[PDB]
Amino acid sequence: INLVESGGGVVQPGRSLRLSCAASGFTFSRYGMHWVRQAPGKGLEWVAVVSSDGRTTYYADSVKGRFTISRDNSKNTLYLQMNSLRAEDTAVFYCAKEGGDNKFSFDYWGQGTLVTVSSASTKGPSVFPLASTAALGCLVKDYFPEPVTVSWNSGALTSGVHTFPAVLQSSGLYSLSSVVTVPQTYTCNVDHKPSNTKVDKTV
Amino acid sequence: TQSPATLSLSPGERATLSCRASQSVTNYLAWYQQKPGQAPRLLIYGASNRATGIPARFSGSGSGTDFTLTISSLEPEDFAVYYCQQRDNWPPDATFGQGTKVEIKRTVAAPSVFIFPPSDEQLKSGTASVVCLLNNFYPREAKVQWKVDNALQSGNSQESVTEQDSKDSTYSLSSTLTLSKADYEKHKVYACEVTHQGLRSPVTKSFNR
Numbered sequence: 208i209n210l211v212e213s214g215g216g217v218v219q220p221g222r223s224l225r226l227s228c229a230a231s232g233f234t235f236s237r238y239g240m241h242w243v244r245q246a247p248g249k250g251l252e253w254v255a256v257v258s259s260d261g262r263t264t265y266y267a268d269s270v271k272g273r274f275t276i277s278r279d280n281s282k283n284t285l286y287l288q289m290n291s292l293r294a295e296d297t298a299v300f301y302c303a304k305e306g307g308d309n310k311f312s313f314d315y316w317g318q319g320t321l322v323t324v325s326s327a328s329t330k331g332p333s334v335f336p337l338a339s340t341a342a343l344g345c346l347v348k349d350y351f352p353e354p355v356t357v358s359w360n361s362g363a364l365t366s367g368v369h370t371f372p373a374v375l376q377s378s379g380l381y382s383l384s385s386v387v388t389v390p391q392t393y394t395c396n397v398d399h400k401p402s403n404t405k406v407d408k409t410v
Numbered sequence: 411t412q413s414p415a416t417l418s419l420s421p422g423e424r425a426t427l428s429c430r431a432s433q434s435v436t437n438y439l440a441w442y443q444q445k446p447g448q449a450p451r452l453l454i455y456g457a458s459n460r461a462t463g464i465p466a467r468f469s470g471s472g473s474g475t476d477f478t479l480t481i482s483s484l485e486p487e488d489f490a491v492y493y494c495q496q497r498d499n500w501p502p503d504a505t506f507g508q509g510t511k512v513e514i515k516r517t518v519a520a521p522s523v524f525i526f527p528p529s530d531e532q533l534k535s536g537t538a539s540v541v542c543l544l545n546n547f548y549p550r551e552a553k554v555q556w557k558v559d560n561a562l563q564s565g566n567s568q569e570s571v572t573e574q575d576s577k578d579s580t581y582s583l584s585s586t587l588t589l590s591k592a593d594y595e596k597h598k599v600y601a602c603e604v605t606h607q608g609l610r611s612p613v614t615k616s617f618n619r
């Protein structure tokens with residue numbers, strides 16, 4: 208029993224994405240399938256379902272007319288065509304299987320795939336410094352998209368480190384802070400792969 | 411509706427969680443466990459049946475429209491987020507409870523507070539970020555109030571919190587106040603005032619531009 212998703216991506220509003228979720232380990236055509244999304248910092252939110260034989264679909268109000276769910280039983284794959292994407296669609300989308308002994312529950316899930324919708328463009332961050340028990344840090348500001356990594360002294364300093372979850376600013380750019388409390392030298396190593404930004408910052 | 415929103419228990423204690431559904435139809439109710447960064451794992455199906463691989467310490471039952479999920483004795487891997495779920499025949503849509511978080515109970519710890527002025531680096535770039543750090547506190551609930559020359563700030567700050575620390579089980583919080591540079595440059599006193607249980611009275615850190 209397995210489900211592998213793919214298709215997630217960073218997209219601008221109005222564009223389209225197609226998600227995939229291939230199934231293996233039980234025979235696909237026997238069960239109904241669903242898509243459940245989870246926005247950043249929110250709960251499970253149901254999206255749509257498609258019947259076993261693929262002929263009757265159903266959608267949540269917020270995506271009707273825009274997303275269409277379907278499946279190809281022959282190739283054991285469920286699909287979610289997503290058009291007219293808006294900024295509020297960004298969430299992790301999982302495909303899920305109706306239960307075998309009760310199908311009002313979801314017994315299996317895909318690993319999930321990220322859908323990011325933004326009118327922002329890829330950008331490297333600016334790393335600004337935050338200066339008996341002292342605290343210092345690095346403000347990793349104005350970047351897009353997620354994610355970024357932060358370490359101190361090339362991984363050597365680890366105790367007392369708190370790297371906060373990124374926050375999405377009004378500008379559409381992310382921003383995150385990474386601190387460390389100390390009772391020598393301090394360098395935050397920042398890596399923003401989407402833009403090839405490697406920045407060491409000695410505080 | 412799920413509740414409570416948060417359950418602070420120690421390992422070995424009994425965790426009892428609530429979910430109020432639309433119907434009492436026993437068969438349309440389920441429970442999931444979810445940890446950060448991972449997909450939902452089915453625990454209970456049909457309101458009282460344990461799914462494949464779910465240990466005996468997890469139990470469930472329904473009384474009217476109120477379903478309860480019981481964790482007889484909390485183990486270390488049980489501190490996660492739990493959702494209840496519902497779906498019937500037609501129409502087919504599922505609905506999810508908004509989730510209950512099982513948190514690690516710890517002793518109260520007041521946050522040590524730090525205020526950070528915008529660096530000269532960012533100011534030459536056109537902006538001003540004022541940061542407020544609340545370090546290693548418990549419990550989670552904490553209120554930060556930003557101040558500029560005595561003016562109460564509202565809508566211009568954002569905060570984020572870390573997961574419960576693995577060694578001490580506390581929380582750390584960061585609050586960033588965004589001001590335009592020229593705005594920042596025309597005021598003098600900046601302060602984050604913090605309210606927390608471990609503090610008998612509010613504490614505020616401040617600096618003069």
Ligand SMILES: *O[C@H]1[C@@H](O)[C@@H](CO)O[C@@H](OC)[C@@H]1O[C@@H]1O[C@@H](C)[C@H](O)[C@@H](O)[C@H]1O
Nearest residue numbers: 239256257258259263310498499500502
């Ligand atoms: O199980 C299906 C069957 O009961 C027929 C005829 O009674 O009705 C269908 O719904 C109109 C039932 O399928 C429902 O929708 C599909 C998409 C789901 O996969 C099923 O679990 C059920 O909810």
